[PDB]
Amino acid sequence: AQINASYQRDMAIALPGMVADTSKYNIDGACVVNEGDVLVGAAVQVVQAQAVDGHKLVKALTTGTTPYGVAIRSHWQTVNAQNQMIYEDGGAINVMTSGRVWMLSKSTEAPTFGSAVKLDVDGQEKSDGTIETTWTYAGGWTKYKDIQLVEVQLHQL
């Protein structure tokens, strides 16, 4: 008559800008987007730290600025824009100063384990990026559909 068939499909490992593991991590609140929009899987910069109140003005990375943290995926704080998850001007942001996270990538070659992480002008991981960062790779290297992701270990500044 006929032969029955059974299929099998595996889920993706991770999504951009999500906490990779349950190791010791620190997420800092009380940060407001001073200008523009910040992607979830991108670094940020500290424009100003208020001396009395405590809020820290955060902005997307530009040329010649030290990175401070990476945004974190959340289904409540974030706002959907350009078919992506984003943080808008104003409001609060969730940037992690220490831990592991999946980050957006533009490099095409898998990195080594204990090597320093370099970022481009726009705050995305790149093999030959100009900006030098104290953070080191963690070995994770996957790709969701057409988006390349890399796992990076962060340290407190």
């Binding site: 032969i3 029955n4 068939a5 059974s6 299929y7 099998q8």
Partner: protein, 53 residues
Amino acid sequence: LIPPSMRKVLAIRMPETTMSYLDYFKSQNSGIEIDSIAELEDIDGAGTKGVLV
């Protein structure tokens, strides 16, 4: 257990006397149950198919 791609190979008919090879095989080999699973198409990770009896 055969891959779900050779399922169209056993569906070819007998030389001249109608019916598929599967019908003759089941008639002369009663008792054996034939099924297909999708895990038998990338056995070595390089594109090698296989059958388990």
